[PDB]
Design a protein around this ligand. Sequence first.
Ligand SMILES: COc1ccc(NCCNC(=O)[C@H](CC2CCCCC2)Nc2nc3ccccc3o2)cc1
Length: 220
Amino acid sequence: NRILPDSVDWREKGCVTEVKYQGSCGACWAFSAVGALEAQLKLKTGKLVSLSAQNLVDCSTEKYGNKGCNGGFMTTAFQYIIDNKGIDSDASYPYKAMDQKCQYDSKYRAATCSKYTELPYGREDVLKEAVANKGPVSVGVDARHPSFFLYRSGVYYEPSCTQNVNHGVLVVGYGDLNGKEYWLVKNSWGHNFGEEGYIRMARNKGNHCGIASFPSYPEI
Ligand SMILES: COc1ccc(NCCNC(=O)[C@H](CC2CCCCC2)Nc2nc3ccccc3o2)cc1
């Protein structure tokens, strides 16, 4: 294992925005993407600003292989931001949990992206390094299991979990709670979900729920 802090929590560094609520629109991928970029924006500019998930839903569309409320990719969302030369703030381009026409306006730009990096498949050591040295990392997890929806506390370990990931989330840290290593994950199902919108998921337990399957992070 690499030399790195035993625990990280980017919330303590003011790099994580409020937990969002995606409602009945499958835009987790867009929440995951903007979450990652939000952290980089704070690191670069000193300002913590929620970015427009809606902008991705409406604008990073077929050209990026995305389907708005019916799914998409965090990496191709980053590419859209690069190509588009920006993304609007959440305040300026609010989230309506539906597919809408692209309404991007550079007058409302709140961040840029120059590149993104996809981490190697399933490597939790590399993910740890990135979370420690780069910032929060966009990942997908297998969130299909009834136990996920009902998670309240502790470290989530579900024997039935798979590496077939279906839900974009954000790794904002990691640590150890009562001898269980975890990844600290920001979800987008509101504050009602889990621990004020967060879930601790099992770390170094065989890429549990595929958390380290498809990690990426952007740079400004
Ligand atoms: C409540 O959170 C949700 C959980 C599941 C869903 N299902 C529909 C939306 N699906 C998704 O967002 C998945 C998640 C993605 C993010 C993490 C890395 C890879 C997997 N992404 C996705 N599905 C696609 C289908 C066709 C074309 C592109 C697609 O992109 C919707 C929302």
